[PDB]
Amino acid sequence: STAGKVIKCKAAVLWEEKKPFSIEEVEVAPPKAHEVRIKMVATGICRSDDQVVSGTLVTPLPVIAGHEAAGIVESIGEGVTTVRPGDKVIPLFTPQCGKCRVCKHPEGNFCLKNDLSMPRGTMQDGTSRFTCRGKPIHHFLGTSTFSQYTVVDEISVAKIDAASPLEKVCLIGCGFSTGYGSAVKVAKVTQGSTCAVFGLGGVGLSVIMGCKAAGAARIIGVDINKDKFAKAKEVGATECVNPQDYKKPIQEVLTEMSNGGVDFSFEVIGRLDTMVTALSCCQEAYGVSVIVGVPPDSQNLSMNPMLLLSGRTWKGAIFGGFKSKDSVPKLVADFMAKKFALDPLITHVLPFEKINEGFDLLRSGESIRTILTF
Amino acid sequence: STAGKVIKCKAAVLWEEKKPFSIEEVEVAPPKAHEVRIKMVATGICRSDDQVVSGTLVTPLPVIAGHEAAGIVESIGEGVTTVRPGDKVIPLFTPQCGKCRVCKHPEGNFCLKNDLSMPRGTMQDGTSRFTCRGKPIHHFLGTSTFSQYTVVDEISVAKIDAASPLEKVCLIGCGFSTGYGSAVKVAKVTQGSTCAVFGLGGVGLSVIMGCKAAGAARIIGVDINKDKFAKAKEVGATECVNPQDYKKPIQEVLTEMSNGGVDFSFEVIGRLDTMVTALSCCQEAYGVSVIVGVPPDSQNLSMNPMLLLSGRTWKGAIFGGFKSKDSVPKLVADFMAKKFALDPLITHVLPFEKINEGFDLLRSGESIRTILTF
Ligand SMILES: NC(=O)C1=CN([C@@H]2O[C@H](COP(=O)(O)OP(=O)(O)OC[C@H]3O[C@@H](n4cnc5c(N)ncnc54)[C@H](O)[C@@H]3O)[C@@H](O)[C@H]2O)C=CC1
Ligand SMILES: NC(=O)C1=CN([C@@H]2O[C@H](COP(=O)(O)OP(=O)(O)OC[C@H]3O[C@@H](n4cnc5c(N)ncnc54)[C@H](O)[C@@H]3O)[C@@H](O)[C@H]2O)C=CC1
Ligand SMILES: O=CNC1CCCCC1
Ligand SMILES: O=CNC1CCCCC1
Ligand SMILES: [Zn+2]
Ligand SMILES: [Zn+2]
Ligand SMILES: [Zn+2]
Ligand SMILES: [Zn+2]
């Protein structure tokens, strides 16, 4: 019926920085070879989507943002083999081509087909499937989930269990997997360790979940918003600290609290100052610090390399280090088998048409994840 | 009989920065409880000792420098159990107390009794065993090997094989173990990998030996002094590049040479700029960069944390990550078993009285290791 035809549908178009999204009709072209058109069912509001509006995460405008989502395949282009119409799918903002040197590496996940390092805001073929007011509109990270329909490359979609609750498992497309994999796969948090988690939003709470799963003895949440502390303790924080409470820099506080520095620290905010603070607070000889937060475009940090020479390890990761297309269906299977909880991350639910209210909730500090339903 | 008595002997005293060493008579106190007085046999000239002269490595002056050495125990203080008079020994500039949280950690070696982080230039008890022209003279890293006799704490000395050649194994006290362990223990270089080594002095050549032992397929040496390239190839470099030969920054050259970035990079120089270049030239998703060189005191580097967010790992280490008192005897045993070579690091052998000439050979580019013999 709609196969092979342009679909006219509602999307949230961002015409310029620092403005509300515009909910209006777009034209969604049918999928080309090795492309998949998806009817969206639910999408989450991640701070990365806000960063696009703030201009601190740079991608070409105008754009259809959104990258944390789940839906149902509407149609497949020629040569698609890994999904079919009617399949439940999660779009992958980090693709998995399976062919590049990264995809073939045992540890690597940052596939060389990504649109994150040098964003074009297109499909793999360097064109757009979106028109609004007769003007072409950019894609975002090969996903663009703030639309009733989107088109993605095959390497940017995973088929998931037919019985999964899409209004929950959408968080596996970004914030849960990112935080959980940061702890269990990138840091490799050990049993009995002391962790510090900087930032207690959806992604930091998922890092806590991962530290708890790994058997950490102490999980210290760090946030300047003390309203975040109760939920951080519910999902495994053993104690919470607000830097604003202290006369001393928090790295010194966390060093004293952990009797010489923590085993593992995580920056889950996106500030240069807290990336350096998080490295400093891990133990100088054997500590590991993981950058998860996305820092402001084109800005450098300053740091003393003696922090590394003593023995620290500093690393970062996209999407929790997970190879996206292998990992997402397994993560959904694990959720279905009650291996981790998503409900603690979901604080608010809104129809897609109230997207701007959803972004107001995040910016106020009130929400963790708002899930938008189409 | 010198046991229990002050020894008057020859030492190389550094009275102030940027001056030659003064070869003169010093007084060496007998060892107190848990102290060891050593007759030195051979000591190497390490760039770290030159950095004390330059003022880029800060330690209290005046000082008896020297940390890369081997000698024979002359006498032991009360309570000493791990060495005896007549034993061959290597002083440990990183101690191994065996009791602190680091010494008990499987991957830590930066023992909390170290005199590196906040240098006092004393014995563990906060006093000095050296006087010269009626003035107290500081110790350096708890070793001070530019002296016919030194006194060290027991946790800063290892017993080695009675048959070892001290004019070669002195290098296990610093440069060989530092570079070799940076490759095999800290980086954990893999078989078939591509490595880049910035700086082809004694420590960088030892990194190359460790990358070769680990089965690297490609080992790219990087030095501005092309006279360093022949020896780097002898010990395992597959190609050498001089940044000065290129119009482009060398991180771009090494990324192209390695078809998208190296597996492992090592900074073995001590410059902030080359620390950032070495991080940048490792593959952005799964690369590992190790800081070995000592940067200039109190200077910060500037870097874009997106280099880490993509998946890089950045770490540093002291003494190749080896727990010093456990590892040094085993390394000497391995040298005796022909598991690695030290002769390729030794370009010059001078009597101790020619220490200044040795330092001039290093500064001029002409030497790798000069060994001074007492
Ligand atoms: N590496 C990756 O693959 C991913 C990265 N990100 C990034 O992770 C970060 C966190 O994302 P969300 O959890 O959605 O954001 P969020 O805004 O809900 O959470 C961040 C938290 O940081 C706290 N915070 C702000 N300034 C702080 C300070 N100076 N000190 C201590 N706490 C402070 C806030 O109060 C807030 O609770 C953002 O930068 C986001 O762009 C998100 C997902 C994927
Ligand atoms: N982490 C640790 O435990 C240890 C650190 N050190 C440090 O390791 C470094 C190397 O020590 P050595 O091998 O004894 O020094 P070295 O001076 O013999 O070798 C340094 C090499 O770097 C090259 N170089 C200088 N500027 C360069 C540039 N801009 N680009 C490329 N090459 C450049 C020189 O030409 C030279 O061959 C020093 O900073 C020293 O203090 C040494 C031993 C222990
Ligand atoms: O939140 C999802 N993706 C982020 C990942 C980090 C780089 C910017 C985009
Ligand atoms: O070369 C020997 N030791 C160095 C180790 C790093 C700090 C300066 C001292
Ligand atoms: Zn996200
Ligand atoms: Zn790929
Ligand atoms: Zn110790
Ligand atoms: Zn040295």
Short mmCIF file of C-alpha atoms in Angstrom, two decimals, chain A residues 181-328:
data_model
loop_
_atom_site.label_atom_id
_atom_site.label_comp_id
_atom_site.label_asym_id
_atom_site.label_seq_id
_atom_site.Cartn_x
_atom_site.Cartn_y
_atom_site.Cartn_z
CA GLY A 181 28.28 -0.98 28.60
CA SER A 182 30.49 1.94 29.85
CA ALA A 183 30.66 0.07 33.22
CA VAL A 184 30.57 -3.67 32.22
CA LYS A 185 32.44 -3.59 28.85
CA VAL A 186 34.62 -0.41 28.68
CA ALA A 187 35.73 0.07 32.34
CA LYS A 188 35.25 -3.72 33.17
CA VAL A 189 34.25 -2.81 36.77
CA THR A 190 35.44 -5.56 39.20
CA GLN A 191 33.75 -7.21 42.16
CA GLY A 192 34.38 -5.28 45.45
CA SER A 193 35.56 -2.09 43.70
CA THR A 194 34.76 1.58 44.47
CA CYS A 195 33.20 3.51 41.56
CA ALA A 196 32.40 7.26 41.20
CA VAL A 197 29.72 8.27 38.65
CA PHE A 198 29.63 11.95 37.64
CA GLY A 199 26.13 12.80 36.39
CA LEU A 200 22.94 11.05 37.49
CA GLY A 201 20.73 11.36 34.44
CA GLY A 202 19.51 8.44 32.31
CA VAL A 203 23.02 7.50 31.16
CA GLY A 204 24.65 7.88 34.62
CA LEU A 205 21.89 5.81 36.23
CA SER A 206 22.65 3.11 33.60
CA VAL A 207 26.33 3.26 34.57
CA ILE A 208 25.26 2.71 38.17
CA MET A 209 23.17 -0.31 37.09
CA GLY A 210 26.29 -1.69 35.32
CA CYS A 211 28.56 -1.08 38.31
CA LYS A 212 26.02 -2.85 40.60
CA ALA A 213 25.73 -5.81 38.10
CA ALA A 214 29.58 -6.09 38.13
CA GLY A 215 29.47 -6.39 41.97
CA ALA A 216 31.04 -2.97 42.95
CA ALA A 217 31.06 -2.55 46.80
CA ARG A 218 30.73 1.26 46.68
CA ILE A 219 29.11 3.38 44.00
CA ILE A 220 29.39 7.12 44.70
CA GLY A 221 27.02 9.29 42.66
CA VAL A 222 28.07 12.87 41.97
CA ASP A 223 25.57 15.52 40.83
CA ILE A 224 25.03 19.28 41.53
CA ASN A 225 21.25 18.52 41.46
CA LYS A 226 20.50 16.72 44.76
CA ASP A 227 16.99 15.83 43.39
CA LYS A 228 18.81 13.10 41.36
CA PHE A 229 20.13 11.34 44.51
CA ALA A 230 17.06 9.27 45.56
CA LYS A 231 16.75 7.50 42.13
CA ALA A 232 20.58 6.99 42.02
CA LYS A 233 20.39 5.12 45.39
CA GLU A 234 17.33 3.09 44.23
CA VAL A 235 19.37 1.67 41.29
CA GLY A 236 22.55 0.97 43.35
CA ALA A 237 24.44 4.19 44.47
CA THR A 238 25.71 3.57 48.03
CA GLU A 239 26.16 7.32 48.68
CA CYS A 240 25.73 10.59 46.76
CA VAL A 241 27.68 13.84 46.92
CA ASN A 242 26.95 17.34 45.63
CA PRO A 243 30.17 19.27 44.75
CA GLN A 244 28.37 22.51 45.69
CA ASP A 245 28.29 21.30 49.38
CA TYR A 246 32.12 21.35 49.70
CA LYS A 247 34.83 23.94 50.14
CA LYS A 248 37.40 21.60 48.52
CA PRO A 249 37.39 20.40 44.91
CA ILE A 250 35.39 17.20 44.58
CA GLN A 251 38.45 15.20 43.32
CA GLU A 252 40.00 15.76 46.81
CA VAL A 253 36.69 14.81 48.52
CA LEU A 254 36.39 11.60 46.49
CA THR A 255 40.08 10.72 47.07
CA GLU A 256 39.56 11.08 50.91
CA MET A 257 36.26 9.12 50.79
CA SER A 258 37.88 6.20 48.89
CA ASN A 259 41.05 6.23 51.13
CA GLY A 260 43.37 7.22 48.25
CA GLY A 261 41.22 7.30 45.04
CA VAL A 262 38.53 5.21 43.39
CA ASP A 263 38.95 2.07 41.24
CA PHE A 264 36.72 3.37 38.45
CA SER A 265 35.34 6.82 37.64
CA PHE A 266 32.86 7.82 34.91
CA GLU A 267 32.20 11.31 33.44
CA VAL A 268 28.54 11.19 32.35
CA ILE A 269 27.81 14.97 32.00
CA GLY A 270 29.77 16.45 29.06
CA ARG A 271 31.95 19.14 30.68
CA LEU A 272 35.67 19.54 30.25
CA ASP A 273 36.23 20.42 33.98
CA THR A 274 34.45 17.27 35.20
CA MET A 275 36.40 15.06 32.69
CA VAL A 276 39.63 16.20 34.38
CA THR A 277 38.09 15.95 37.95
CA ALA A 278 36.87 12.38 37.21
CA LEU A 279 40.36 11.32 35.98
CA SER A 280 42.05 12.96 39.03
CA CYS A 281 39.74 11.18 41.53
CA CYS A 282 40.68 7.62 40.36
CA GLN A 283 43.66 6.07 42.22
CA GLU A 284 46.89 7.37 40.72
CA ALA A 285 48.58 3.97 40.15
CA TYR A 286 45.77 1.64 38.93
CA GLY A 287 42.64 3.81 38.60
CA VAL A 288 40.54 3.86 35.39
CA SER A 289 38.45 6.84 34.26
CA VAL A 290 35.88 6.55 31.43
CA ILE A 291 34.54 9.59 29.47
CA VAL A 292 30.90 9.04 28.46
CA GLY A 293 29.70 12.68 28.40
CA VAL A 294 29.82 14.62 25.08
CA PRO A 295 31.89 17.81 25.45
CA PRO A 296 31.18 21.13 23.66
CA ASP A 297 32.17 21.19 20.00
CA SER A 298 35.81 22.00 19.13
CA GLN A 299 36.89 22.80 22.72
CA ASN A 300 40.12 21.35 24.24
CA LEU A 301 40.69 20.51 27.89
CA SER A 302 43.90 21.24 29.76
CA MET A 303 45.46 18.56 32.01
CA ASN A 304 48.73 17.59 33.67
CA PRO A 305 50.04 14.34 32.03
CA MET A 306 51.64 13.34 35.36
CA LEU A 307 48.05 12.15 36.19
CA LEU A 308 48.67 9.39 33.57
CA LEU A 309 52.42 8.76 34.14
CA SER A 310 51.70 7.43 37.68
CA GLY A 311 49.56 4.62 36.20
CA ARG A 312 46.03 5.92 35.52
CA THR A 313 44.10 4.76 32.47
CA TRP A 314 41.85 7.24 30.66
CA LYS A 315 39.46 6.13 27.99
CA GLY A 316 36.18 7.02 26.34
CA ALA A 317 33.51 5.19 24.36
CA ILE A 318 30.47 5.57 22.16
CA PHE A 319 27.36 3.43 22.89
CA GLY A 320 28.96 1.62 25.86
CA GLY A 321 31.54 -0.01 23.58
CA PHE A 322 28.83 -2.33 22.22
CA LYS A 323 29.01 -3.58 18.59
CA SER A 324 25.56 -2.15 17.91
CA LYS A 325 23.79 -4.64 15.59
CA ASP A 326 25.13 -7.78 17.44
CA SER A 327 24.45 -6.27 20.91
CA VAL A 328 21.03 -4.53 20.70
#
